[PDB]
Design an enzyme around this catalytic site. Structure first.
Site, PDB file in Angstrom:
ATOM      1  N   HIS A  78      -2.431  -4.544  -2.276  1.00 13.06           N
ATOM      2  CA  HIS A  78      -3.559  -3.619  -2.540  1.00 13.06           C
ATOM      3  C   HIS A  78      -4.773  -4.433  -2.999  1.00 13.06           C
ATOM      4  O   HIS A  78      -5.232  -4.256  -4.150  1.00 13.06           O
ATOM      5  CB  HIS A  78      -3.100  -2.517  -3.505  1.00 13.06           C
ATOM      6  N   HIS A  82      -6.505  -5.782   2.486  1.00 13.52           N
ATOM      7  CA  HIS A  82      -6.033  -4.418   2.869  1.00 13.52           C
ATOM      8  C   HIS A  82      -7.232  -3.478   3.038  1.00 13.52           C
ATOM      9  O   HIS A  82      -7.256  -2.736   4.042  1.00 13.52           O
ATOM     10  CB  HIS A  82      -5.049  -3.853   1.843  1.00 13.52           C
ATOM     11  N   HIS A 118     -11.485   2.587  -1.009  1.00 13.85           N
ATOM     12  CA  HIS A 118     -10.349   3.527  -1.205  1.00 13.85           C
ATOM     13  C   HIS A 118      -9.244   2.948  -2.111  1.00 13.85           C
ATOM     14  O   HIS A 118      -8.472   3.775  -2.623  1.00 13.85           O
ATOM     15  CB  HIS A 118      -9.771   3.963   0.144  1.00 13.85           C
ATOM     16  N   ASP A 119      -9.098   1.619  -2.241  1.00 14.10           N
ATOM     17  CA  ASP A 119      -8.079   1.016  -3.144  1.00 14.10           C
ATOM     18  C   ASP A 119      -8.706   0.093  -4.200  1.00 14.10           C
ATOM     19  O   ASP A 119      -7.940  -0.625  -4.847  1.00 14.10           O
ATOM     20  CB  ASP A 119      -7.011   0.262  -2.357  1.00 14.10           C
ATOM     21  N   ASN A 239      -0.242  -0.376   9.356  1.00 13.24           N
ATOM     22  CA  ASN A 239       0.443  -1.698   9.349  1.00 13.24           C
ATOM     23  C   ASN A 239       1.542  -1.745  10.407  1.00 13.24           C
ATOM     24  O   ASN A 239       1.569  -2.678  11.204  1.00 13.24           O
ATOM     25  CB  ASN A 239       1.035  -2.038   7.982  1.00 13.24           C
ATOM     26  N   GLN A 287      11.737  -0.152   6.001  1.00  7.43           N
ATOM     27  CA  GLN A 287      10.701  -0.078   7.062  1.00  7.43           C
ATOM     28  C   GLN A 287      11.062   0.995   8.095  1.00  7.43           C
ATOM     29  O   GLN A 287      10.155   1.694   8.525  1.00  7.43           O
ATOM     30  CB  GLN A 287      10.431  -1.452   7.677  1.00  7.43           C
ATOM     31  N   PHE A 290      10.422   4.512   6.366  1.00  2.91           N
ATOM     32  CA  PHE A 290       8.939   4.598   6.359  1.00  2.91           C
ATOM     33  C   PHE A 290       8.425   5.001   7.741  1.00  2.91           C
ATOM     34  O   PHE A 290       7.574   5.889   7.824  1.00  2.91           O
ATOM     35  CB  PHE A 290       8.345   3.245   5.964  1.00  2.91           C
TER      36      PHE A 290
HETATM   37  C1  LIG Z   1       3.957  -2.561   5.255  1.00  6.74           C
HETATM   38  O1  LIG Z   1       4.779  -1.495   4.785  1.00  6.74           O
HETATM   39  C2  LIG Z   1       4.247  -0.570   3.932  1.00  6.74           C
HETATM   40  C3  LIG Z   1       2.896  -0.379   3.679  1.00  6.74           C
HETATM   41  C4  LIG Z   1       2.475   0.600   2.797  1.00  6.74           C
HETATM   42  C5  LIG Z   1       3.400   1.404   2.146  1.00  6.74           C
HETATM   43  C6  LIG Z   1       3.052   2.506   1.201  1.00  6.74           C
HETATM   44  N1  LIG Z   1       4.033   3.231   0.789  1.00  6.74           N
HETATM   45  N2  LIG Z   1       3.834   4.236  -0.094  1.00  6.74           N
HETATM   46  C7  LIG Z   1       5.130   4.975  -0.221  1.00  6.74           C
HETATM   47  C8  LIG Z   1       5.366   6.011   0.870  1.00  6.74           C
HETATM   48  C9  LIG Z   1       6.395   7.056   0.442  1.00  6.74           C
HETATM   49  N3  LIG Z   1       7.409   6.511  -0.487  1.00  6.74           N
HETATM   50  C10 LIG Z   1       8.794   6.572  -0.297  1.00  6.74           C
HETATM   51  N4  LIG Z   1       9.544   6.408  -1.405  1.00  6.74           N
HETATM   52  C11 LIG Z   1      10.884   6.449  -1.321  1.00  6.74           C
HETATM   53  N5  LIG Z   1      11.607   6.643  -0.218  1.00  6.74           N
HETATM   54  C12 LIG Z   1      10.888   6.817   0.935  1.00  6.74           C
HETATM   55  C13 LIG Z   1      11.423   7.036   2.249  1.00  6.74           C
HETATM   56  C14 LIG Z   1      10.451   7.281   3.150  1.00  6.74           C
HETATM   57  S1  LIG Z   1       8.861   7.029   2.536  1.00  6.74           S
HETATM   58  C15 LIG Z   1       9.485   6.788   0.930  1.00  6.74           C
HETATM   59  C16 LIG Z   1       6.845   5.965  -1.737  1.00  6.74           C
HETATM   60  C17 LIG Z   1       5.387   5.573  -1.592  1.00  6.74           C
HETATM   61  C18 LIG Z   1       2.627   4.412  -0.790  1.00  6.74           C
HETATM   62  O2  LIG Z   1       2.442   5.372  -1.532  1.00  6.74           O
HETATM   63  C19 LIG Z   1       1.587   3.316  -0.619  1.00  6.74           C
HETATM   64  C20 LIG Z   1       0.157   3.694  -1.040  1.00  6.74           C
HETATM   65  C21 LIG Z   1      -0.617   4.345   0.054  1.00  6.74           C
HETATM   66  C22 LIG Z   1      -0.167   4.488   1.281  1.00  6.74           C
HETATM   67  C23 LIG Z   1       1.036   3.785   1.805  1.00  6.74           C
HETATM   68  C24 LIG Z   1       1.618   2.791   0.830  1.00  6.74           C
HETATM   69  C25 LIG Z   1       4.757   1.219   2.396  1.00  6.74           C
HETATM   70  C26 LIG Z   1       5.192   0.247   3.284  1.00  6.74           C
HETATM   71  O3  LIG Z   1       6.511   0.010   3.571  1.00  6.74           O
HETATM   72  C27 LIG Z   1       7.479   1.048   3.314  1.00  6.74           C
HETATM   73  C28 LIG Z   1       8.102   0.875   1.955  1.00  6.74           C
HETATM   74  C29 LIG Z   1       7.936  -0.331   1.276  1.00  6.74           C
HETATM   75  C30 LIG Z   1       8.500  -0.536   0.034  1.00  6.74           C
HETATM   76  C31 LIG Z   1       9.235   0.461  -0.561  1.00  6.74           C
HETATM   77  C32 LIG Z   1       9.410   1.667   0.086  1.00  6.74           C
HETATM   78  C33 LIG Z   1       8.858   1.893   1.348  1.00  6.74           C
HETATM   79  C34 LIG Z   1       9.100   3.225   1.981  1.00  6.74           C
HETATM   80  F1  LIG Z   1       9.461   3.149   3.253  1.00  6.74           F
HETATM   81  F2  LIG Z   1      10.080   3.893   1.387  1.00  6.74           F
HETATM   82  F3  LIG Z   1       8.030   4.017   1.946  1.00  6.74           F
HETATM   83 MG   LIG Z   2      -4.372   3.979  -2.072  1.00  6.09          MG
HETATM   84 ZN   LIG Z   3      -4.626   1.768   0.851  1.00  7.18          ZN
END
Ligand SMILES: COc1ccc(C2=NN(C3CCN(c4ncnc5ccsc45)CC3)C(=O)[C@@H]3CC=CC[C@H]23)cc1OCc1ccccc1C(F)(F)F
Ligand SMILES: [Mg+2]
Ligand SMILES: [Zn+2]
EC number: 3.1.4.53
Length: 329
Positions: A78, A82, A118-119, A239, A287, A290
Site C-alpha cells: 500500500h 500501488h 485512494h491509499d 493485480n 490467490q 481471492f
Molecule cells: C495481489 O493480491 C492481492 C491484492 C490485494 C488484496 C486485497 N485484499 N483485501 C481483502 C479482500 C477480502 N478479504 C478476504 N479475507 C478472508 N478470506 C477471503 C477469501 C476471499 S477474499 C477474503 C480480506 C481483505 C483488501 O481488503 C485489500 C484492500 C483493498 C482492496 C484489495 C486488497 C488481496 C490480494 O490477495 C488476496 C489475499 C492476500 C492475502 C490474504 C488474503 C487474501 C484473500 F484472497 F483472502 F483476499
Molecule cells: Mg484502500
Molecule cells: Zn488500493
C-alpha cells in the site's frame, strides 16, 4: 533543455502508459521512486487536464511530489507504486471503447485524482487491525471505513501546502462536484462495500442501455458515479489481471504486508487474521480464493458492461488463476 539518459529510458517506458501491463516497478526504479508523480504528470498532459483546469505545471509537480511523499516507502503493498498502478489502470479503463465520450473532463479528473490519493498514508495494516488496536484513526472515524476516510482527508489536506492547490482555478461548482465524486469513489474502495457495488453493477448490466453508437448511456449521477466507483475498484483489484510477472510481485508485497500484520497480531495476542501466516494459510490457495470469490465475479461483470473491450484482461485473469491452481499440492 534535453532529457538526461535516465530521463530518456523513463520516457520510453512511459510510451506504455495507455497499455494494460505497464512496467510500473521499472518506472518506479527509473523515476527515483516517483512512479505516482511521473505517471500522473504523463496522464495529465496526455488528457490535456492542465489546460482544461488551468493547473499551473509547477503546482501540479509540487502537489504530486508532496502526495507521493505521504505514501510510506516502509510499507510493501500500500505505497506510491500501488497508487501509480491504480492511477494508470483507471486511466486505461477510462479509454475503453464502450465508454468513448461518455464522461466529462471533471468526471475523468475525479477518477484519476481519486485513484492517486485512494491509499495515501496507508500504515500497512487493515481497518479491523486499526479498530481492534484502538488506534487514533479508528477513533477519529468512529470505526467506519477508517482508512478510506483518512486517505481522502490527507489527499485533500495536502492541497493546502505551499503551491500545492492544483484546483485553485476551478469554480466553486466545479470543486464541489469534483470533491463529492472523489469522496464517493475512494469510500467505494473499502472491500466491505464490494458486495453492493457488484450488485449495483450486475443490476446495471441487466438494465444496460446504449446510444446510437455502441457507448453506454448513463443519464443520472447515481449511474455515472456507480460506473466510476466500480471502475476504480476494478483498478484497485486489477493485480491478478496483469501479466504474471507483475501479478506475482503484487502477491509478494501483499503477503509481506499481511505476514507483517500477522507478526504484529502475535505480540498483541489478537489471534491471527485472514490467511496471514505460514504456520498454516497457503499463499496459492489464498490467490485462488481471492480470484474465485472477488476478482473474477467483479471483472466478469465489468467485462459484460463493456463487452467486448475487456476480453483479453478477463482471459489473462483466468490464465493467472489456472497458473495458481496448478501450484497447489
Ligand atoms: C495481489 O493480491 C492481492 C491484492 C490485494 C488484496 C486485497 N485484499 N483485501 C481483502 C479482500 C477480502 N478479504 C478476504 N479475507 C478472508 N478470506 C477471503 C477469501 C476471499 S477474499 C477474503 C480480506 C481483505 C483488501 O481488503 C485489500 C484492500 C483493498 C482492496 C484489495 C486488497 C488481496 C490480494 O490477495 C488476496 C489475499 C492476500 C492475502 C490474504 C488474503 C487474501 C484473500 F484472497 F483472502 F483476499
Ligand atoms: Mg484502500
Ligand atoms: Zn488500493
Amino acid at each position: 533543455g534535453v532529457k538526461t539518459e535516465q530521463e530518456d529510458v523513463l520516457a520510453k517506458e512511459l510510451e506504455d502508459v495507455n497499455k494494460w501491463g505497464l512496467h510500473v516497478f521499472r518506472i518506479a526504479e527509473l523515476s527515483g521512486n516517483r512512479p505516482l508523480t511521473v505517471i500522473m504528470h504523463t496522464i495529465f498532459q496526455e488528457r490535456d487536464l492542465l489546460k482544461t483546469f488551468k493547473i499551473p505545471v509547477d503546482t501540479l509537480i509540487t502537489y504530486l511530489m508532496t502526495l507521493e511523499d505521504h505514501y510510506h516507502a516502509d510499507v510493501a503493498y500500500h505505497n506510491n507504486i500501488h497508487a501509480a498502478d491504480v492511477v494508470q489502470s483507471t486511466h486505461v479503463l477510462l479509454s475503453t471503447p464502450a465508454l468513448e465520450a461518455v464522461f466529462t473532463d471533471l468526471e475523468i479528473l475525479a477518477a484519476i485524482f481519486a485513484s492517486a490519493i485512494h491509499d495515501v498514508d496507508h500504515p500497512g495494516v487493515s481497518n479491523q487491525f486499526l479498530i481492534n488496536t484502538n488506534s487514533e484513526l479508528a477513533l477519529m472515524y468512529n470505526d467506519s471505513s477508517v482508512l478510506e476516510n483518512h486517505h481522502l482527508a490527507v489527499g485533500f489536506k495536502l492541497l493546502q501546502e505551499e503551491n500545492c492547490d492544483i484546483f485553485q482555478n476551478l469554480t466553486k461548482k466545479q470543486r464541489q462536484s469534483l470533491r463529492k465524486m472523489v469522496i464517493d469513489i475512494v469510500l467505494a474502495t473499502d472491500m466491505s462495500k464490494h458486495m453492493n457495488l457488484l450488485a449495483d453493477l450486475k443490476t446495471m448490466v441487466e438494465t444496460k442501455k446504449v446510444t446510437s453508437s455502441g457507448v453506454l448511456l448513463l443519464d443520472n449521477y447515481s449511474d455515472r458515479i456507480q460506473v466510476l466507483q466500480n471502475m476504480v475498484h476494478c483498478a484497485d483489484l486489477s493485480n491478478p489481471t496483469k501479466p504474471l510477472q507483475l501479478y506475482r510481485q503484487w502477491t509478494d508485497r501483499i503477503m509481506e504486508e499481511f505476514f507483517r500484520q500477522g507478526d504484529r497480531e502475535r505480540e498483541r495476542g489478537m489471534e491471527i487474521s485472514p490467511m496471514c501466516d505460514k504456520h498454516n494459510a497457503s499463499v496459492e490457495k489464498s490467490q485462488v480464493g481471492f480470484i474465485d470469490y472477488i476478482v473474477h465475479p467483479l471483472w466478469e461483470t465489468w467485462a459484460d458492461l463493456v463487452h467486448p473491450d475487456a476480453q483479453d484482461i478477463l482471459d489473462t485473469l483466468e490464465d493467472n488463476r489456472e497458473w495458481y491452481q496448478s501450484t497447489i499440492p
